[PDB]
Structure 1
Amino acid sequence: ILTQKLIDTRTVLIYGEINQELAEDVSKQLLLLESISNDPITIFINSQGGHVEAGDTIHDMIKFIKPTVKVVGTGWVASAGITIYLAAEKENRFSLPNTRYMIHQPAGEIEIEAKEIIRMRERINRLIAEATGQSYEQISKDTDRDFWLSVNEAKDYGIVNEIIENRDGLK
């Protein structure tokens, strides 16, 4: 009965480095909660990012499942973590006060590798633009280097919709 009442809260924690092992763990939890009901799921994210394709899977799984997903940013949300965060609809994107956000152009035969990283950076930047309401050209410009945003700046930028301190903030 230790995780029984935890499963009832319909909450997933994504804390730490984004990798395939974490993507598998998160995928299993989301698939389980979907099999139980169509009630909303809340995801808390504290992540510096990590593996791009692992980030892509979690993102797509969030949109794949039937239940509506709310995200709460906490501590920091960066890179691959941002891709996950942005899978939720703008209305459902929350942040705790002590959180900073970061977008950038991630790292990844040299001709083949260069082309892939270019295509990956385009795909990621179009994803960020579509989710935030910013233009593709604006994202491309800002993600030239490590672009760190405070919680209030990330709100103005269109990443965070609502800054909350308490439970009722989720309503």
Structure 2
Amino acid sequence: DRRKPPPPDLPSLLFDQRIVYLGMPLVPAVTELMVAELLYLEKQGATLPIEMLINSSGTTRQDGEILSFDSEGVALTSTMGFIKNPISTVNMGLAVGWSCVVLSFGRKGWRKSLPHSLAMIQQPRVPPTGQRQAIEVHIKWREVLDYKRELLRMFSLGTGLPVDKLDADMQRPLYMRPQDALEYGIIDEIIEPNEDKAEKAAQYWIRSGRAESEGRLEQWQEYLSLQEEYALKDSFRKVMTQDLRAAYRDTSSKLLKNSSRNMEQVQEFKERLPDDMLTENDEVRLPFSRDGVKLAILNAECYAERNIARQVAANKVSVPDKWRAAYAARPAPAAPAA
């Protein structure tokens, strides 16, 4: 203790525990320190793990300000591939642009993240040229193509997705949830909160009585009552549009044409009966809704307030004020108005 001096500040304390903290955005001043930090830890041993924290907006700002290029993000992942020790990276909050590329370039199985962190990948930003010549635009576009393909190359080895899949989602800025990053291939597991803090906080609200005495029971009842009224509202919206489709199929049954058999000859020959096709077109069957449930009892509501209408029969010749179209429309026996 007497021979070893204490660390003078906070980044020197995290340096002694082999913890690299990327808390600054990707500027050229901070990238020369990270290639000096990772190369110094390789000389102290190629078997010790390296802890890495990621908190930056990448090479650009979140509002759209271009402060650097995307090429400094390429040199950051090159030192991770040149090194030969296991690296455990932890995403801390924000991860935009090249900050999630170095998050995915870690060792598989040790990529960690917070449950409420933010991850996003998008296309790199290009500064304006300033009204230069014509042939420099094609070389500048080739500089975009070499840096976009290099970004898709480093993103494919960290996740495993093909190049054509990753290029289509990168055209728009797609934000990634920590629950969504597991199936995408960004991280490997979710850092859980302290279980000792969870059971002590849950036992404090029961013993002190603050979970029921401060009016929480009357407000949580209104949360279940508003969810019950919202579940009653969309169910009434769904039975009305089902009766509209049932009335649409009943009005379509009074038709005498051969337009349905023309589509059967040009399409496939297997399913001549209504059956499943295992594709996008999942045809629902609405008259096959005979539930017969004796548990959904109707409430204390009487339907005697419904008035009596005219109830015009179906065999009528009365037509509305429309343009004439009865050239081949023969009058049906159930619908003479055609």
Tell me the TM-score normalized by structure 2. 0.47
Match of 2:148 in 1: 121
Shift of 1:5: 4.7
Aligned partner (choices 54, 57, 73) of residue 45 of structure 1: 54
Match of 2:172 in 1: 145
Shift of 1:129: 2.0
Three-state SS of the structure 2 residue aligned to 1:49 is coil
Which is greater in Rg? 2
- After the TM superposition, which of the residue ranges 40-49 and 124-133 deviates more from structure 2? 124-133
Which structure has more RCO (C-alpha within 8 Å, separation ≥ 6)? 1
After superposition, give the CA deviation of every residue in 1:58-97 in whole Å (9 maximum; x if it has no partner).
Answer: 2111221232111101111111112222221222211112
Return 5+ residue gaps in structure 2 as ranges: 1-5, 60-68, 127-135, 195-338
Contact 1:104–1:144 (CA under 8 A) maintained in structure 2: yes
1:17-166 paired onto structure 2 within 5 Å: 17-38=25-46, 39-50=48-59, 51-108=69-126, 109-165=136-192
Contact 2:152–2:163 (CA under 8 A) maintained in structure 1: yes
After superposition, give the CA deviation of every residue in 1:17-70 in whole Å (9 maximum; x if it has no partner).
Answer: 112211111111112222222300010001111042221112111221232111
Three-state SS of the structure 1 residue aligned to 2:114 is strand
Contact 1:60–1:87 (CA under 8 A) maintained in structure 2: no
Paired with 2:121 and 2:32, the residues of 1 have a C-alpha distance of 24
Shift of 1:8: 3.0
What's the % identity of the aligned pairs?
28
Contact 1:129–1:135 (CA under 8 A) maintained in structure 2: yes
Shift of 1:160: 1.0
Paired with 1:123 and 1:102, the residues of 2 have a C-alpha distance of 18
Shift of 1:166: 5.4
Three-state SS of the structure 1 residue aligned to 2:116 is strand
When the two chains are superposed, the root-mean-square deviation of aligned CA atoms in Å is 1.8
> How many residues of Structure 1 are paired with residues of Structure 2 in the alignment?
167
Contact 1:90–1:132 (CA under 8 A) maintained in structure 2: no
- AA at the equivalent of 2:33: D
Point out the structure with the larger strand share: 1
Residues 1:22 and 1:60: Cα distance change in structure 2 (over 3 Å): same
Contact 1:91–1:161 (CA under 8 A) maintained in structure 2: yes
- AA at the equivalent of 1:15: G
Three-state SS of the structure 1 residue aligned to 2:85 is coil
Return 5+ residue gaps in structure 1 as ranges: none
- AA at the equivalent of 1:125: L
Point out the structure with the larger helix share: 1
Paired with 2:70 and 2:12, the residues of 1 have a C-alpha distance of 32
Contact 1:56–1:84 (CA under 8 A) maintained in structure 2: no
- After the TM superposition, which of the residue ranges 107-116 and 38-47 deviates more from structure 2? 107-116
Contact 2:14–2:20 (CA under 8 A) maintained in structure 1: no
Tell me the TM-score normalized by structure 1. 0.89
After superposition, give the CA deviation of every residue in 1:109-153 in whole Å (9 maximum; x if it has no partner).
Answer: 211111111221122112212211112111001001111111111
Please list every run of at least 4 consecutive aligned residues from structure 1 whose deviation after the TM superposition is greater than 6 angstroms: none
Shift of 1:4: 6.0
